[PDB]
Amino acid sequence: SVKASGGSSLARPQLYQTVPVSAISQAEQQDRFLEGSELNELTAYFQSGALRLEIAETLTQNADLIVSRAANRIFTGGSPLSYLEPIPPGFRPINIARYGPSNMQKSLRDMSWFLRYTTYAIVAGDPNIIVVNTRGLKEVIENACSIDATIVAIQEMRAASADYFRNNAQAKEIVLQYFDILLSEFKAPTPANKVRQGPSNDIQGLELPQSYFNAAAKRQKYAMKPGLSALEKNAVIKAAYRQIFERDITKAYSQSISYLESQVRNGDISMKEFVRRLAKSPLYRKQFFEPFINSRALELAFRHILGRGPSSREEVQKYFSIVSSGGLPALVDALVDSQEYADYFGEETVPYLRGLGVEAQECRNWGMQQDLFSYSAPFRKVPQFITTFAQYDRPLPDQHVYGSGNDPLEIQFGAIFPKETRNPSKRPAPFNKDTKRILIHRGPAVNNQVGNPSAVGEFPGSLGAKVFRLNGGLPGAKVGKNTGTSVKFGESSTQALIRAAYRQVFGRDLYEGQRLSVAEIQLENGDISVREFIKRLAKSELFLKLYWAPHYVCKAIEYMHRRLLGRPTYGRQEMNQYFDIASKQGFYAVVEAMIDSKEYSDAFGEDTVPYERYLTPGGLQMRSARVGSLREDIGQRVDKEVTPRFV
Amino acid sequence: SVVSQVILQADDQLRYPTSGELKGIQAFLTTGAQRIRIAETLAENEKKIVDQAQKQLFKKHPEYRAPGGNAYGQRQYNQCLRDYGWYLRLVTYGVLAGNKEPIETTGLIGVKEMYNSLNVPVPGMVDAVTVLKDAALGLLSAEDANETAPYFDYIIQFMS
Amino acid sequence: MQDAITAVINSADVQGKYLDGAAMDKLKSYFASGELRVRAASVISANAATIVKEAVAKSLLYSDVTRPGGNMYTTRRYAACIRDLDYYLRYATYAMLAGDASILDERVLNGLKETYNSLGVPISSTVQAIQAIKEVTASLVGADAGKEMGVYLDYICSGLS
Amino acid sequence: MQDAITAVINSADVQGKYLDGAAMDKLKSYFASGELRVRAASVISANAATIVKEAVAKSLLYSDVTRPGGNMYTTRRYAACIRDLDYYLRYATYAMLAGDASILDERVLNGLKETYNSLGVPISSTVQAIQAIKEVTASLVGADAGKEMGVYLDYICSGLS
Amino acid sequence: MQDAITAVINSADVQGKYLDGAAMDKLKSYFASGELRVRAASVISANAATIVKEAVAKSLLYSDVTRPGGNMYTTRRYAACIRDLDYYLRYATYAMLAGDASILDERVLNGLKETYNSLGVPISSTVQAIQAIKEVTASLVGADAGKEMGVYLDYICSGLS
Amino acid sequence: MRMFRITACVPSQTRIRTQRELQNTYFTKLVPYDNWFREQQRIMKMGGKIVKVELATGRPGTNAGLA
Amino acid sequence: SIVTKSIVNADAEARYLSPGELDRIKAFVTGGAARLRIAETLTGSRETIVKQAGDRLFQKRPDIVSPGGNAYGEEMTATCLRDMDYYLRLVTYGVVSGDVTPIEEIGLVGVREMYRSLGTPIEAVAQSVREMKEVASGLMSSDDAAEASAYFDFVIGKMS
Numbered sequence A: 001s002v003k004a005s006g007g008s009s010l011a012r013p014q015l016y017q018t019v020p021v022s023a024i025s026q027a028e029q030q031d032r033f034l035e036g037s038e039l040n041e042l043t044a045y046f047q048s049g050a051l052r053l054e055i056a057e058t059l060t061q062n063a064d065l066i067v068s069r070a071a072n073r074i075f076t077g078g079s080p081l082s083y084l085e086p087i088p089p090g091f092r093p094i095n096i097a098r099y100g101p102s103n104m105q106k107s108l109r110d111m112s113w114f115l116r117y118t119t120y121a122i123v124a125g126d127p128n129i130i131v132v133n134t135r136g137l138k139e140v141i142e143n144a145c146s147i148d149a150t151i152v153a154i155q156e157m158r159a160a161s162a163d164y165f166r167n168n169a170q171a172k173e174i175v176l177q178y179f180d181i182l183l184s185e186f187k188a189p190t191p192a193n194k195v196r197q198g199p200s201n202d203i204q205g206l207e208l209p210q211s212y213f214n215a216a217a218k219r220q221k222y223a224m225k226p227g228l229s230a231l232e233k234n235a236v237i238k239a240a241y242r243q244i245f246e247r248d249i250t251k252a253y254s255q256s257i258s259y260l261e262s263q264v265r266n267g268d269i270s271m272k273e274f275v276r277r278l279a280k281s282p283l284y285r286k287q288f289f290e291p292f293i294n295s296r297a298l299e300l301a302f303r304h305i306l307g308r309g310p311s312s313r314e315e316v317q318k319y320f321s322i323v324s325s326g327g328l329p330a331l332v333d334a335l336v337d338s339q340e341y342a343d344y345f346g347e348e349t350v351p352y353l354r355g356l357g358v359e360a361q362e363c364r365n366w367g368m369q370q371d372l373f374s375y376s377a378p379f380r381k382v383p384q385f386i387t388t389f390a391q392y393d394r395p396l397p398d399q400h401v402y403g404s405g406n407d408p409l410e411i412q413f414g415a416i417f418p419k420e421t422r423n424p425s426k427r428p429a430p431f432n433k434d435t436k437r438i439l440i441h442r443g444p445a446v447n448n449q450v451g452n453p454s455a456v457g458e459f460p461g462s463l464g465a466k467v468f469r470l471n472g473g474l475p476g477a478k479v480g481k482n483t484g485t486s487v488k489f490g491e492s493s494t495q496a497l498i499r500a501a502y503r504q505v506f507g508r509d510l511y512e513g514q515r516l517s518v519a520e521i522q523l524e525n526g527d528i529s530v531r532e533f534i535k536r537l538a539k540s541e542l543f544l545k546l547y548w549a550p551h552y553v554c555k556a557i558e559y560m561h562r563r564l565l566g567r568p569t570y571g572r573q574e575m576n577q578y579f580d581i582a583s584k585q586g587f588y589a590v591v592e593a594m595i596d597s598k599e600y601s602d603a604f605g606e607d608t609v610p611y612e613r614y615l616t617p618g619g620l621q622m623r624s625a626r627v628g629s630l631r632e633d634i635g636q637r638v639d640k641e642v643t644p645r646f647v
Numbered sequence B: 001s002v003v004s005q006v007i008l009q010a011d012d013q014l015r016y017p018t019s020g021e022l023k024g025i026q027a028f029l030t031t032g033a034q035r036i037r038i039a040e041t042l043a044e045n046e047k048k049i050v051d052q053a054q055k056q057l058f059k060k061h062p063e064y065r066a067p068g069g070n071a072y073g074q075r076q077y078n079q080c081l082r083d084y085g086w087y088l089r090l091v092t093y094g095v096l097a098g099n100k101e102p103i104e105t106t107g108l109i110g111v112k113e114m115y116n117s118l119n120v121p122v123p124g125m126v127d128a129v130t131v132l133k134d135a136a137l138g139l140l141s142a143e144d145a146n147e148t149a150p151y152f153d154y155i156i157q158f159m160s
Numbered sequence C, D, E: 001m002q003d004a005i006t007a008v009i010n011s012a013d014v015q016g017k018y019l020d021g022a023a024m025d026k027l028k029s030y031f032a033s034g035e036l037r038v039r040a041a042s043v044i045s046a047n048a049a050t051i052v053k054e055a056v057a058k059s060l061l062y063s064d065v066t067r068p069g070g071n072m073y074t075t076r077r078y079a080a081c082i083r084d085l086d087y088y089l090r091y092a093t094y095a096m097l098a099g100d101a102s103i104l105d106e107r108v109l110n111g112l113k114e115t116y117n118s119l120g121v122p123i124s125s126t127v128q129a130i131q132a133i134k135e136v137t138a139s140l141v142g143a144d145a146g147k148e149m150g151v152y153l154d155y156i157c158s159g160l161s
Numbered sequence F: 001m002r003m004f005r006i007t008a009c010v011p012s013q014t015r016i017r018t019q020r021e022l023q024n025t026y027f028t029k030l031v032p033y034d035n036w037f038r039e040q041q042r043i044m045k046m047g048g049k050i051v052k053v054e055l056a057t058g059r060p061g062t063n064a065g066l067a
Numbered sequence G: 001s002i003v004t005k006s007i008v009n010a011d012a013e014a015r016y017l018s019p020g021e022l023d024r025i026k027a028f029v030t031g032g033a034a035r036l037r038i039a040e041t042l043t044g045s046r047e048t049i050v051k052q053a054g055d056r057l058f059q060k061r062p063d064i065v066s067p068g069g070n071a072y073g074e075e076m077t078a079t080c081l082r083d084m085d086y087y088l089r090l091v092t093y094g095v096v097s098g099d100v101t102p103i104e105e106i107g108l109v110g111v112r113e114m115y116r117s118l119g120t121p122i123e124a125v126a127q128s129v130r131e132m133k134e135v136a137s138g139l140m141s142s143d144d145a146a147e148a149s150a151y152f153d154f155v156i157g158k159m160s
């Protein structure tokens, strides 16, 4: 399996274009309200739509009759309708028995599905659904189906739909032209596939059929020609600002460089030269270079100029070396004066975001580019490309099975988790079921249960956390100290145990009206053991309110396991177990399961208060990789400082 | 040529041709005596190859000669043998240079929309190359055929 | 770019005058023949591949250009020319919808004369190829629409020549 | 680029005919002298930095151009001329390897002649520098390949002038 | 761009000699007038819109250009002329601060003559607009600073003509 | 900053395969001096033909004061 | 116009106008006689609207005609009467075109910095069009004025 995941954000491909879709998206890409044009697109469609309902309603009802009259004309030698699911060029009627039942079932359903897609075409009001699904169909159907028989079948249906309807010339012509498009697209052979050639050796070459880029909403492409009237020239410049700055900033804040605008309006500098000068401008520098790391600003510079994310590990490595050498100008210069930029946009065309629909996509930087094309990209300040690309070659990282966000910070108190929304730093990794996470023991390294399972109930001797035990006799256990004995020495020890037992369940010491006084005195009397006392504090409504309720279910399970057992979960096997209990039984039973677990009983007895036994490598790094606490012999060469021989 | 492909790849990285790149040239220049031999046996023996290729095509595809076809006229039928003669000409250019580039630039780059605008089927011409391949390699000797084989196969790939 | 209605605004705008009777009657003509402009463009849109196909058939096919030595021989060159003729057709289709010839000079005829001279494209054959479209398109849309179609197609070839 | 092997191919492509014995004799010459070209390229590749220096010291250094007033005085312009001559040798190696001076017509002499007139780069001083390159590369490789190398370096000299 | 300091440095570097007393007097002249140049630039920056305000009013407004059929009729073109004259003021302020007319020759008068001929912008009325600026800018800061700006504005006048 | 008034046609080699829209390959633009070496090399590698180049911005043979 | 917005968007999409887009052009052309009727009434009483809303502007905003303002005597008053005459002409151009294109191209682009250089307040010239909308709506029928006001409020909104 793969060791890294870039993310799997929802992809929404446009299967076919409708009139409302074509109208709305036209102004959406331009970042405008629907003007007198785009409103009139809808107005004429909504008026005709009532008639377009009557087209389909007749054709949906009489669908059985159209396909029956078609199949009878085409297929000879029996009845084709036994197993229902004008210009002849030179067709020969196909025998029913000779063609075979399996081929006949295909033939019949396609004839119905051709008419079905015609009815959808009128209702949509755009023959896009036809153009896509009919263009590259002649070639694939040629193998085991005659083309000559299909043309006359559609032409029969054209006449069949004409005679059955026949209302008005303003009504029937919609039926006629859509059928006329249908036969013309079917007569047309399969066009050449769109070949996305790799710009260098590092990036793979791709191919996309001439059907996928026929529906998936074409990105509006603006080119600065010197003769254009200044209204559409303004539309080009606004689009150029919408590409570089992700949004129209000249409308928002009136932030515009008129010095550069004037030169492009004339034709002194090209759009290639404009993008160059605009991306090295202090206006871009402040917004997409200054707030970001060198790696992330590089990743943003890719989508602004080239209109795509970095494709390969080698590409990020190359372009980071450029931005380290000469900075932002040198990076911009490398991006504009590339073989890719001049191939896609040339000199005149404004850069555009080439995503799922525009071109063929590679299976490498899918989710990394999906989040990048979003407007929420310049808030993810953690790089997504260089992180995933490096993690691809490496094995599985030190991470919780349900992501990096599921890992809490290894602190004394407070369940603090990285938020998915606030500062996107989600790092998915394909963890399987039987994947045990390597955990660092607080005590001796030999006392790890992975290598030494017998030494699970061994106390950390001044290496890890302090162990609290009810070793000493509880006050008022035996009737030796009769009535009096005001100075019973064994009283402060059990109270310190209670406080520590509170400190383990809830990281911090609680307030006055939060302490369970009933549970405390039962432990002090010797009615319940520590195991029962820890269980009661974790079964408290306060623990539910503070740690369980405000947090994500599996985050709350993970933190509870780090508090009750003092250990992060090894992997899926344990996490799925408690998550199954959380679904069926509830929170209280999850508490019960973690206490009544065998590993709890082995590590901590009936008198032992739980403690931090194991840390995550990331957690220990936070503790012992700071300026202090770090030893000299961790990751540094130690030279023996000896007095010189001349001294 | 493979000579051009090396110096393109070297210029792309802005460097001189490498040790393995120069040896790739060295290997081609030695086997150039065989490359010359490919040309003569196909150019002079064109009339036998072209006639065998066309008779096998129109037998397997009796549609273009049939009513409502593509090549019904005698001037149209000569154009089908013209293409056959041009493709085998392109094969010779490819082998001699050593790579697909001569075939690529002349008769592969944008070849689908070529015959789309002439109503000639590309799935019909993908079967035309195969019978031309079968006729050519049959006349060629055993060790000579295996050299000329993958050049024909690339044309098949780009068609359909 | 402008239209037939936008040009009559701009011609009255330079004088700084309201829409007079000489401007109003020119507004009538385009508004009456506008329905004829829509229908013919819809026919062209549906049969976009056919006109280009038939234009080459009676001009460039079985000719000196397609024979080796010209600029129509290779499949790289041939596919480029039919792409151009498709574009020349498309921008002409926009021209008749607008009722303005300045759209040709706008996007197409910016410097397509001199860029053809740079690559060594024969102009005389290209003009004849443009002329070939006129006969095919007029038979498809009609004599009334084809004459209106012919003007903008003539505007393409005249600037190239 | 157009190699010497592809030169006879492209010439036959324009003619639309097969390669004759009067055309393949030039190809046979390329196949025979090909092993000489590779070894010549291997020597130049290894000693790429040294050829430049031995040419600059012979012609350019201790002259009026390197002294104040000249175009090769400032370090910025000095590094430019060193860069230029590095590209001049590298592309001459390509033409030597390909066997044709088409790459010098395409990827060298495209607009190089006019840029040098724009900046005010001395044409006579550049020719002298390439002539200095010619004499060094002939001494390093040999008289057999260096004379062949000298043809392509003459093409740059005739191209600049 | 070359300022008054760098112009002396460049001239000395061409000959390749140290800064002598014949060249240092030019530097001494700039450092003495430096207080006058900065103080003037502060006044121009203060009244950046105010200089343009009066200049257009006394020359361009109530004329043939602002009237329909002119080049200052449309608000788009009007704002462009306002945009132009603030560049003619800002870069002249840059030239005053620099102490050399190198900035105006490269970033303003690059192809400004060719631009004004192509679009149909009247040069004669533009010259009058610069002369309108000159008279306003002189009677705002002083006679000495006004004639300093006047020289750089005359460079714009001579450049456009 | 010195700028070159450059005039070059750069025909697309992949336009047929990529199936992208037609762009005006002939352009007269100003290009910075620091970028011109990378610009010129890019054009002539695509098989583009350079027509006319003019030093519009700057003085020929300048030592000090460029940008 | 609507027909300009068709082609510009079609070239951006690099494809022919769709039947949905063609239905818009159909509706605009057929409904072109109705929109021409709007301009005919406005060009007829062009003196009436500008004068009536002119005195309304001096009534509602006295500060304009009052000492200190832009309007002084008759010579500065006539220019304000000329400006309102220009904008009413601009409305009629946008009325016949069916779109807000000729309003923008002639007199709306950089309108803020246009009146900044003159010293005219932008909200005052917005108020003049507001009053011009009110008088024009009272002259013709209400249903007819609904289309007319839509181009009027565009002039107001950008100068607001």
Ligand SMILES: *[C@H](C)[C@H]1/C(=C/c2[nH]c(/C=C3N=C(/C=C4\NC(=O)C(CC)=C4C)C(C)=C\3CCC(=O)O)c(CCC(=O)O)c2C)NC(=O)[C@@H]1C
Pocket (backbone or CB within 6 Å): A293, A294, A295, A296, A316, A317, A320, A386, A390
């Ligand atoms: C040296 C002290 C130790 C070390 C460094 C090391 N770094 C890399 C590679 C990268 N460096 C970075 C980090 C940064 N990106 C930023 O934005 C910033 C802040 C301005 C920095 C410092 C990144 C993202 C990379 C990746 C780019 C690349 O591939 O070079 C390496 C190379 C590792 C590799 O080849 O994958 C190294 C070695 N590591 C050590 O061993 C030293 C102790």
Ligand SMILES: *[C@H](C)[C@H]1/C(=C/c2[nH]c(/C=C3N=C(/C=C4\NC(=O)C(CC)=C4C)C(C)=C\3CCC(=O)O)c(CCC(=O)O)c2C)NC(=O)[C@@H]1C
Pocket (backbone or CB within 6 Å): A411, A412, A413, A414, A415, A416, A507, A508
């Ligand atoms: C007081 C100076 C300012 C302040 C404090 C404040 N803190 C919290 C809550 C928490 N404090 C911590 C931090 C720590 N965890 C550790 O391990 C240590 C070191 C031993 C510390 C100090 C944590 C984890 C929390 C979260 C909840 C908890 O108590 O476990 C709050 C409440 C925040 C909330 O909304 O819940 C506050 C207000 N804030 C101010 O306004 C003072 C300037």
Ligand SMILES: *[C@H](C)[C@H]1/C(=C/c2[nH]c(/C=C3N=C(/C=C4\NC(=O)C(CC)=C4C)C(C)=C\3CCC(=O)O)c(CCC(=O)O)c2C)NC(=O)[C@@H]1C
Pocket (backbone or CB within 6 Å): A438, A439, A440, A441, A442, A444, A445, A446, A447, A448, A450
């Ligand atoms: C010996 C080859 C080198 C070396 C080893 C070293 N390791 C540690 C500490 C730990 N080792 C591990 C790793 C694992 N536990 C697992 O579950 C697995 C997978 C099966 C492995 C390999 C862990 C978790 C620790 C932390 C302590 C613990 O046992 O929980 C140390 C001590 C580090 C310290 O400072 O505490 C050392 C020295 N180092 C060398 O010098 C050798 C080259």
Ligand SMILES: *[C@H](C)[C@H]1/C(=C/c2[nH]c(/C=C3N=C(/C=C4\NC(=O)C(CC)=C4C)C(C)=C\3CCC(=O)O)c(CCC(=O)O)c2C)NC(=O)[C@@H]1C
Pocket (backbone or CB within 6 Å): B064, B070, B071, B076, B077, B079, B080, B081, B082, B083, B084, B086, B087, B090, B106, B107, B114, B118, B120, B121, B124, B125, B128, C061, C062, C063, C066, C073, C074, C075, C076, C078
């Ligand atoms: C025969 C195998 C099939 C066939 C052929 C056929 N082709 C055409 C049209 C043309 N084919 C070419 C040839 C080429 N273009 C290139 O670039 C190359 C590589 C160098 C080749 C081989 C060209 C340019 C044309 C058009 C030129 C002309 O018409 O003279 C036709 C004519 C179309 C028609 O019917 O009018 C034909 C018949 N036809 C089949 O059905 C066979 C499968």
Ligand SMILES: *[C@H](C)[C@H]1/C(=C/c2[nH]c(/C=C3N=C(/C=C4\NC(=O)C(CC)=C4C)C(C)=C\3CCC(=O)O)c(CCC(=O)O)c2C)NC(=O)[C@@H]1C
Pocket (backbone or CB within 6 Å): C065, C070, C071, C072, C076, C077, C078, C080, C081, C082, C083, C084, C085, C087, C088, C107, C108, C112, C119, C121, C122, C125, C126, C129, F010, F011, F012, F013, F015, F022, F023, F024, F025
């Ligand atoms: C066909 C009628 C003749 C022909 C055409 C031909 N032209 C070129 C070169 C190009 N033409 C274009 C296309 C356009 N540029 C534009 O801006 C427009 C308007 C929208 C058009 C139509 C371009 C850009 C090129 C350059 C190549 C590219 O695709 O980028 C060629 C190719 C020349 C070559 O060998 O490179 C051809 C073949 N030539 C003929 O022989 C016909 C008579």
Ligand SMILES: *[C@H](C)[C@H]1/C(=C/c2[nH]c(/C=C3N=C(/C=C4\NC(=O)C(CC)=C4C)C(C)=C\3CCC(=O)O)c(CCC(=O)O)c2C)NC(=O)[C@@H]1C
Pocket (backbone or CB within 6 Å): D057, D060, D061, D062, D063, D066, D073, D074, D075, D078
């Ligand atoms: C002395 C500090 C070290 C040294 C000097 C050395 N330099 C050269 C060669 C040249 N030096 C230059 C460089 C410049 N010319 C300029 O215009 C500038 C910037 C203002 C400089 C610094 C040049 C052009 C030459 C070429 C000589 C010529 O006049 O044509 C040499 C000679 C190298 C040789 O053997 O050919 C030497 C010795 N070298 C050392 O060892 C010292 C540490």
Ligand SMILES: *[C@H](C)[C@H]1/C(=C/c2[nH]c(/C=C3N=C(/C=C4\NC(=O)C(CC)=C4C)C(C)=C\3CCC(=O)O)c(CCC(=O)O)c2C)NC(=O)[C@@H]1C
Pocket (backbone or CB within 6 Å): D065, D070, D071, D072, D077, D078, D080, D081, D082, D083, D084, D085, D087, D088, D091, D107, D108, D112, D115, D119, D121, D122, D125, D126, D129, F033, F034, F035, F036, F037, F038, F040, F041, F060, F061, F062
């Ligand atoms: C050295 C032989 C002589 C010399 C050179 C010199 N050249 C420049 C400037 C440039 N040279 C080029 C030319 C090329 N671009 C290409 O594509 C090729 C072919 C591979 C070449 C050689 C370019 C583009 C420049 C501009 C520099 C840049 O970085 O863009 C200079 C500098 C000119 C100046 O005044 O700044 C010089 C000095 N001149 C001499 O004196 C030598 C005789």
Ligand SMILES: *[C@H](C)[C@H]1/C(=C/c2[nH]c(/C=C3N=C(/C=C4\NC(=O)C(CC)=C4C)C(C)=C\3CCC(=O)O)c(CCC(=O)O)c2C)NC(=O)[C@@H]1C
Pocket (backbone or CB within 6 Å): A259, A261, A262, A263, A265, A266, E065, E071, E072, E077, E078, E080, E081, E082, E084, E085, E087, E088, E107, E108, E112, E115, E119, E121, E122, E125, E126, E129
């Ligand atoms: C006002 C004094 C006169 C006037 C001006 C006018 N200019 C244009 C168009 C342009 N103005 C420039 C000039 C500059 N842009 C720069 O970058 C610089 C240097 C900092 C300057 C001075 C350019 C390049 C253009 C063309 C592109 C653009 O419009 O910005 C117009 C518009 C012309 C048109 O119709 O497109 C106008 C009106 N016109 C007059 O009548 C005044 C006397």
Ligand SMILES: *[C@H](C)[C@H]1/C(=C/c2[nH]c(/C=C3N=C(/C=C4\NC(=O)C(CC)=C4C)C(C)=C\3CCC(=O)O)c(CCC(=O)O)c2C)NC(=O)[C@@H]1C
Pocket (backbone or CB within 6 Å): E057, E061, E062, E063, E066, E067, E068, E072, E073, E074, E075, E078, G064, G069, G070, G071, G076, G077, G079, G080, G081, G083, G084, G086, G087, G106, G107, G118, G120, G121, G124, G125, G128
């Ligand atoms: C009246 C509604 C308000 C007003 C008007 C006012 N305008 C000016 C001066 C000018 N107004 C324009 C505007 C245009 N003229 C055009 O050609 C166009 C495009 C169709 C427009 C919109 C211009 C350019 C001028 C200059 C005069 C000229 O044409 O030469 C003034 C005079 C300002 C002065 O003192 O110079 C006035 C008073 N001002 C208000 O306060 C009213 C609310």
